[PDB]
Design an enzyme around this catalytic site. Structure first.
Site, mmCIF file in Angstrom:
data_model
loop_
_atom_site.group_PDB
_atom_site.id
_atom_site.type_symbol
_atom_site.label_atom_id
_atom_site.label_comp_id
_atom_site.label_asym_id
_atom_site.label_seq_id
_atom_site.Cartn_x
_atom_site.Cartn_y
_atom_site.Cartn_z
ATOM 1 N N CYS A 32 3.792 2.111 3.858
ATOM 2 C CA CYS A 32 2.790 2.752 3.041
ATOM 3 C C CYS A 32 3.427 3.984 2.118
ATOM 4 O O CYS A 32 3.913 4.976 2.680
ATOM 5 C CB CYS A 32 1.808 3.392 3.797
ATOM 6 N N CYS A 35 1.646 7.523 2.247
ATOM 7 C CA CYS A 35 2.106 7.954 3.687
ATOM 8 C C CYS A 35 3.401 8.411 3.488
ATOM 9 O O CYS A 35 3.768 9.530 3.973
ATOM 10 C CB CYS A 35 1.876 6.620 4.681
#
Lengths: 104, 106
Positions: A32, A35
């Site tokens: 991600c 993230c």
């Protein structure tokens, strides 16, 4: 980033909430982008807020813990204060995250 | 299978054109690594069926980071809603109920 605790089951999760007055859970997924962007921010916050316990949780590996915190997007940072889910910062938002943690 | 037929936004021109050429629109901002995004596919499929006056497109944030940046997409999935030539708001996360409500209100 690699040094903070990873939650892997509901028992660890519930233990963490009951043992720590102030807690941040980083709900992420592997690969991600947003993230990953947040990792160096979390590192700095860990150092800046030593009385707050920071942990992480992989939403794909631990879908049950995610559901328990009503996590539907990544990254989400769940903020716990004295056993309560007191706030949630949805997304890669350094400024909202610091403010939330600052107030814990 | 229906999700594969959905038009992808791949550059900023297509993005601005989308906004100028459609009365009502939804952009599904997704990533290939995003599990909850995949979970939303059958919900998006149904919404496309159910809302013939709304234009649906998708945007892979890793293939089109400039579009994702312009829409301040900081969490996956994000659904950006547009109407009468402007973007009006976002539904953030795998939440088909909130998504349908935002679409219904367009």
């Amino acid at each position: 980033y690699t040094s903070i605790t990873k939650l892997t089951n509901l028992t660890e999760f519930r233990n963490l909430i009951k043992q720590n007055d102030k807690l941040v859970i980083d709900f992420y997924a592997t690969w991600c982008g947003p993230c990953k962007m947040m990792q160096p921010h979390l590192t700095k916050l860990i150092q800046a807020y030593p009385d707050v316990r920071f942990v992480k949780c992989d939403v794909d590996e631990s879908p049950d813990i995610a559901k328990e915190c009503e996590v539907t997007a990544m990254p989400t940072f769940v903020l716990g204060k004295d056993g309560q889910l007191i706030g949630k910062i949805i997304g890669a938002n350094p400024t909202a995250l610091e403010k939330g943690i600052k107030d814990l």
